[PDB]
């Protein structure tokens, strides 16, 4: 129904035709420019018989076919014009010698050129173009019309056509449509009566007074009707007192309202777009690919190092590639030469501050291998968002996690690590590593634990306890990665943003919170904080014990509904003495104030 435009010029044998064909059949509205350049004399042109509208310009240059039949072409919009001047550009459509020349331009239904002019020159055997009243078609009075220097030995125009025709036939006549209308219409009329103007949604002329009578839509087309906007995605339901998805929803693809975007198009906001913006991500909703805000930063996947890669370790030339990376396709290797520099390959030492680039990493598909770490960095808090180590690819003797000979590390600091899907674990020769002794690897390491742990020769458990380096009281029997309530494997009571807490803000505190599977989530804003009582039982405006501002149905709202469009018109409400939102009078136009008719607007 709707196809894209080509954007080339006179720039270009068999492929070119293939590209043209697949592109324009079976489309009706060209979102761009219709460019027909260098086409053979016996090429099938029936795939262009359904084109009704072209939003850009029409370029017909150096073709060899005898006739160009566009019987359904009604409107050339001219949003993009050729050489800044022409909506229609026809030039050089004839063969080197041979009788393979274009003789007829069949635009029998061409009614309107909204912007741009017409250029028809140097077509040796093209006739009848000098008889057409182009001013009847071209809306803009300032546009240039240049039709000259074409066919010289041309047949007279048929007597039925009255001197104006697209061809020599009796059905090839041009039908004049420009009429004289009254002042009330701003140049948009279908008759001379002041009550015979075109609809306000008509771009130019029209066949009648209705939505459905335009030659071209001023904004959008909805299944035959020219509309200011496509049907809204959301609609206020009077019975559920909130915005519900509209069944009649259509999205913006150019100037047409469509129920679903094409194959390679996503829905952002109200419109079909080529790709999703950097601030939003692609998600499947009700059958369609929609764009929704990432809630922070968007997922990004980077290639790793080690096994199956070009880098054996991350270094000065690699570290910059992991910016804003959440998932790592492969492994991470931290070797001695990578951290301190490689003289053989002339790679400088790594800047410790650049290691903070891994703070966005949530998952490592392969293994994690740390054999070298900066002296002043006594932990791996750089990997504090790391949740999963896949172990899909292993290191050495089947290791997925390997912390070796890091004599300055005091605690692990993997406070988000919850799963190591496969592989063995090797943590040794870290002489000052404490906290790891009490950790239950069964909860983290997936599968049978037996013989998959190789943890020894670290700081002895006796020295750690005597120095006070033990787990926080709020930690469960699972253990911890370091000191504090935010370093626990699991909490005894509740957790608030990765930090173990004794209780949520149930009865006091800002913001107020509710419990959900031993986790603290805040109440909806607009819940009035209750003194000595629970504020909410869950998230949402309908789970509040009392509304801060107003109440609409079961929900709490900041502002009473002041013109929210529903199924059959806008919906207005007012806040009564009990701050609850009540409907307005049925005969009110814009405002409310109160329930009575006298309070309107």
């Amino acid at each position: 129904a709707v196809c894209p435009g080509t954007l080339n010029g006179l720039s270009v044998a068999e492929n070119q035709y293939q590209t043209l064909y697949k592109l324009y059949e079976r489309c009706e509205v060209v979102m761009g420019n219709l460019e027909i350049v260098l086409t053979g004399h016996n090429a099938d042109l029936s795939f262009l018989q359904w084109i009704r509208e072209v939003t850009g310009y029409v370029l017909v240059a150096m073709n060899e076919f005898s006739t160009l039949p566009l019987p359904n072409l009604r409107v050339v919009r001219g949003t993009q014009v050729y050489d800044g001047k022409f909506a229609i550009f026809v030039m050089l459509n004839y063969n080197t010698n041979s009788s393979h020349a274009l003789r007829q331009l069949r635009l029998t239904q061409l009614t309107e050129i909204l912007s741009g002019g017409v250029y028809i020159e140097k077509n040796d055997k093209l006739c009848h173009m000098d008889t057409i009243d182009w001013r009847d078609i071209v809306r803009d009075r300032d546009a240039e019309i240049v039709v000259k220097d074409n066919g010289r030995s041309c047949p007279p125009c048929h007597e039925v056509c009255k001197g104006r025709c697209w061809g020599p036939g009796s059905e090839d006549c041009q039908t004049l449509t420009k009429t004289i209308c009254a002042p009330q219409c701003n140049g948009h009329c279908f008759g001379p009566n002041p009550n015979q103007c075109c609809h306000d949604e008509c771009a130019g002329g029209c066949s009648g007074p209705q939505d459905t009578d335009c030659f071209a839509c001023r904004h959008f087309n909805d299944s035959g009707a020219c509309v200011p906007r496509c049907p809204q995605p959301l609609v206020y339901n009077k019975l559920t007192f909130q915005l519900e998805p509209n069944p009649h929803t259509k999205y913006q693809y150019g100037g047409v309202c469509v129920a679903s975007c094409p194959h390679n198009f996503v829905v952002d906001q109200t419109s079909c777009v080529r790709a999703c913006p950097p601030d939003k991500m692609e998600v499947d909703k009700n059958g369609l690919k929609m764009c929704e805000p990432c809630g922070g930063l968007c997922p990004k996947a980077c290639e790793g190092t080690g096994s199956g890669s070009r880098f054996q370790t991350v270094d000065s030339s690699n570290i910059d590639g992991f910016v804003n990376c959440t998932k790592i396709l492969g492994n991470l290797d931290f070797l001695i030469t990578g951290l301190n520099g490689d003289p053989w390959h002339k790679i400088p030492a790594l800047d410790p501050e650049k290691l903070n680039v891994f703070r966005t990493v949530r998952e490592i598909t392969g293994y994690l291998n740390i054999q070298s770490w900066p002296p002043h960095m006594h932990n791996f808090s750089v990997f504090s968002n790391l949740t999963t180590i896949g172990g899909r690819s292993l290191y050495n003797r089947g290791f997925s996690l390997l912390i070796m000979k890091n004599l300055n590390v005091t605690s692990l600091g993997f406070r988000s690590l919850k799963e190591i899907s496969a592989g063995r674990i090797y943590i040794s020769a870290n002489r000052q590593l404490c906290y790891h002794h009490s950790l239950n690897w069964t909860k983290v390491l997936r599968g049978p634990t037996e013989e998959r742990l190789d943890i020894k020769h670290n700081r002895p458990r006796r020295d750690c306890v005597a120095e006070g380096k033990v787990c926080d009281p709020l930690c469960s029997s699972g253990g911890c990665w370091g000191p504090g309530p935010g370093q626990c494997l699991s909490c005894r009571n509740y957790s608030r943003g990765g930090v173990c807490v004794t209780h949520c803000n149930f009865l006091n505190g800002e913001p107020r919170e509710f419990a959900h599977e031993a986790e603290c989530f805040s109440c909806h804003p607009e819940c009035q904080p209750m003194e000595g009582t629970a504020t909410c039982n869950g998230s949402g405006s309908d789970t509040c014990a009392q509304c801060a501002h107003f109440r609409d149905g079961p929900h709490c709202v900041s502002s009473c509904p002041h013109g929210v469009l529903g199924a059959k018109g806008p919906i207005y409400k007012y806040p009564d003495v009990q701050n609850e939102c009540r409907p307005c009078h049925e005969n009110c136009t814009q405002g409310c104030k109160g329930p009575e008719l006298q309070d309107c607007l």
Partner: antibody
Amino acid sequence: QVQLVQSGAEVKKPGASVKVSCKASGYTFRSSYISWVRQAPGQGLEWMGWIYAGTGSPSYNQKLQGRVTMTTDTSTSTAYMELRSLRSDDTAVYYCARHRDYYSNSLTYWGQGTLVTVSS
Amino acid sequence: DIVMTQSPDSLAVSLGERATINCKSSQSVLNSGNQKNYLTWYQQKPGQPPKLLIYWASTRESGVPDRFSGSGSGTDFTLTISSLQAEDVAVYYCQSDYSYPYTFGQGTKLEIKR
């Protein structure tokens, strides 16, 4: 900059044929029209025809009665013109010129010209 | 075919004075579609190829001095030189920019009035 160098002088007997070259440089040769104009000694200018270098589509003057044929070589950026069945009157200086653009046939860049003299 | 007639055939103008050359075409050259006159003026000194001065009746080519000027419409056109210089002596040609066969005028020599 933009240059158009034509071939040397030619001397032919009545009934023979001439092929004159015109090598272009200094601009994109493909997107241009090349026109040919002749001028008899002491007489005025006369348009013979033009040709689009990109495809090779020409347009000749009917008064030459089908004796003129124009060609373009994209590889050498050279235009060629050919006159068949030569006459005494076809003794002229034959000029090779370029149209300024698509919208004007006016000849802005000319060649130095070649003298084609036809006599027995 | 269109016919271009230039008047006079030869013109003698003193140095620094003003020179006008007329051109009359058999058919109109004005295009109602854009109100543009497709008329071209050339200058040819003896021994060298012609030089383009003015196209579209009144528009000068890049490099052409301000003293050269074109006017007229439809079938009557005029080429004026406000102050004739010593390098301005040559034969001047009229040409149709409209269509086939782009006919040249018969030409007019301009000499210094001595």
